[PDB]
Amino acid sequence: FSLSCNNFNAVFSRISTRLQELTVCSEDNVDVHDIELLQYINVDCAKLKRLLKETAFKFKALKKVAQLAVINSLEKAFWNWVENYPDEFTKLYQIPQTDMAECAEKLFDLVDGFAESTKRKAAVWPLQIILLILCPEIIQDISKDVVDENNMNKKLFLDSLRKALAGHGGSRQLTESAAIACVKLCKASTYINWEDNSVIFLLVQSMVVDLKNLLFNPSKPFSRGSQPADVDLMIDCLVSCFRISPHNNQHFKICLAQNSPSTFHYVLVNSLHRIITNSALDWWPKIDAVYCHSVELRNMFGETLHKAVQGCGTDLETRSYKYLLLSMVKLIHADPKLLLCNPRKQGPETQGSTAELITGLVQLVPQSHMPEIAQEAMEALLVLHQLDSIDLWNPDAPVE
């Protein structure tokens, strides 16, 4: 990456030749390691146009494995641009640029022609969305009557996407694929300042209600087919929704309840752990908007601690409690104030809320069964002793 910020032409010359070579061969070849360099090279808006234009010309003549390879890499290159240059992504909606829209639209049709079977469709849907977003006007036209061919192809794309997301279609593959695709659309929306308030925001609201019913449904958890539930997918969904409408979060409570599975409790404690440590854009909501929930989190740290020491003295179920506990301790190490708010204060017959938590951490230091938690619980107690965090123990009377 660092070797491509300046000498972009040097790196880009290796890829361009490879595509030409793969065009000549009449037999599909499985050597595409050179194509997959796009995942890493630094990219900019102007440079990103260069990758789209060149790929458009040659995508019609490549082979099956090459065609798939260019798609995935070209899909990941987009997020390197948005992550590193958020500003340029915003301007794309304040001031229209007809050059970017044309490049995205042309590549859209070629990809659509490639996909004809259900299995192929599941592979390309996550990319096309990223392209339809780049040409804002085509989205608006779909709302009204549809041109014969300019936008008829794109309009059919959405209706197929929503139908599969709800689950009416009899195809598990597409249902899972639509979940992956629509979570990327929500993620990208956050960068748009929404002062434009383009149809993007109105488009997200249409699916957000249908996405959560599919993911945060305790009765029928969403499993790809191998794992009990794809946790990493749910973290992205919950972290992105919070940033859109922080205060009106009715699905924070679903995870925060005690009756919910133990997998949801895992998603909620790592979603909070990204808001704390990964927040570049300023106008996003911050961790302060969650301090009203400190009471529930302390209780969740109570039972989990109780059921982890007790278990060590089902096998799989007990193993879960050790992962949830390890993550909660890492949370205190990042923002202690999230758990030392709304103190209970010392009671005539009951101990305070700060001591109850402080003692819990100590009883993990001398453990030998859990050598990795005992290492983390030491760091947490060493961060609560800093002069900054000592006022929070009891602001009424700290020294005593």
From Swiss-Prot:
Changing residue 251 to L: In a cutaneous neurofibroma from a patient with neurofibromatosis; somatic mutation. Changing residue 188 to T: In a cutaneous neurofibroma from a patient with neurofibromatosis; somatic mutation. Changing residue 44 to V: In NF1; reduced splicing enhancement. It comes from the Eukaryota. Changing residue 251 to D: In a cutaneous neurofibroma from a patient with neurofibromatosis; somatic mutation. This is Neurofibromin truncated. The chain holds residues 143 to 568 of 2839 of the full protein.
